[PDB]
Write a protein that binds this DNA or RNA. Structure first.
Lengths: 87, 86, 86, 84, 84, 87, 86, 86
RNA sequence: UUUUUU
RNA sequence: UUUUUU
């Protein structure tokens, strides 16, 4: 298979009761995007210990794929591959 | 004032209980460019299991949020129950 | 006999389904220091999804419980519906 | 980050939360304990997460609308909590 | 169908079950109570289902590998259980 | 829309941890079937009070529809429209 | 002896966590007429969220039950993780 | 100090995730009348989905609890895995 | 089918 | 993301 796509951006929203949200992707494959793209993010894909969440606006890096949703994340970290911080 | 629009389901993930509506009319006027409106299963007017099916026509109230726009209450045309994809 | 108080929502977490009220009046007399009263979503008087918004004013019945106080029924001022923040 | 230590005051497994009696704040012993809210999601341990009344804990916390709210709770030395 | 009456012996809301002390079996008073298992799913009431220690109950039951196992539990007169 | 299809039969299996099972349909639209047809049944569709379940072999009547699953039930009762009995 | 077969996913309901495998080989021999084998998500060898995608090739162990036949452990070809439809 | 016993599964419900053991030996001495010991799925020594089958023989550590006895660790004879019945 | 997460 | 029901 082709290698998975990668990008970076920030959390648009994340609802912890729902257990999901969206990332605004502002860079893709190492190049800035003129127009940001929303990417779905589920709690199960967040790299961090304990309860998993993202804070609005928090910077993230991720791998993702195309789907019927548009685009969805496969694994999500903070900058530098650090754990996400969450709320 | 509560914001009102109409359109059709863009897509809906039945397992996760949410999707998006493509809004094609807002506040009584047609939109040339459709606008995505988030929709959660809990906001759907219908009996039994709540979901939407891609393409089904909807009328709804909504509000601005960090999601962009999100639904408050969603029905089919004329206030009919939504159909869904159970 | 149920105890009566009023105050405001201290906090409420909708994933948890509960929070605390800061009681600032008890049996009609004002308190200088607020008193914590537990509040479960199942006790909130309102339609739809039940929650409280931080700071919203509430009236309630409550009882003594092993570790403090727990509300039995919670309304807004005048017995109106709570407002919420889902 | 704020840190303290103490012991479980009480814990409610129906609702998934309790209180810690904080007896030291940032390494300074307190004459009287301070209440710290603790949700089950904060407890470092495998399986069903709870605290046993009186068990010793070490924790990070913050000021919030809850009062003092624990963020990550362990036993002594960073080891898992015991629970019931 | 077997029927009896009694009161809640104890109830565990973490695990969702308890025991009824059956003090009458098919309308006949018992010198000593008989244990009857009760799962939360059997309790006739709205909302969160539990029994309060000592609350009076009326119930159908059967013999099973549990011993005596309640099938539908109400309060006096077929009214809802009270719970905690 | 056309009226919903109806049939009768018996529970093939029902797993209460899963919350679902299958019905073996042996009559459809009031006529016996030479070859029985399996019809999915979810707990939410069982007409009865309290915890919802079917016992293996229990006789049922139901409305159903075609789906990607094959066929799935819309509402399930016992004989005569009586509540299901369950376990 | 544990029963072994191979085939492909017939269909799989991701929300409900189950489906059927169309078994086209059993105990080393080809089947002319495929045989339905129930499969639950809990029996799928793969990391992360467990499901199957319609048509994906599978190898599995199974047993007779009131379901007809049901899977005990399911992999892709050669023992590979299943692919799924998350 | 943990108490030791052996016996057999009285019943086990996999939706509940628990059951009871009938203890028929305590600290190596036989009992005429079996004694109930609660058993949670989380205490069962086996791979995969944890359960007990009615009548299967077990060995265990246990403790006194407020309403009876509760098992701490449960195995089959000789410390082998429990068998189960999912 | 003790998810205000059907 | 207190579902051995991810």
């Amino acid at each position: 298979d082709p290698q998975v796509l990668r990008g970076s951006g920030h959390c648009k929203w994340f609802n912890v009761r729902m257990g999901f949200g969206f990332i605004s992707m502002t860079s893709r494959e190492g190049s800035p995007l003129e127009n940001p793209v929303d990417v779905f993010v589920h709690q199960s894909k967040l790299y961090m210990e304990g309860f998993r969440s993202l804070k609005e606006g928090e910077p993230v890096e991720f791998t993702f794929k195309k789907s019927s949703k548009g685009f969805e994340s496969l694994r999500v970290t903070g900058p530098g591959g650090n754990p996400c911080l969450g709320n």
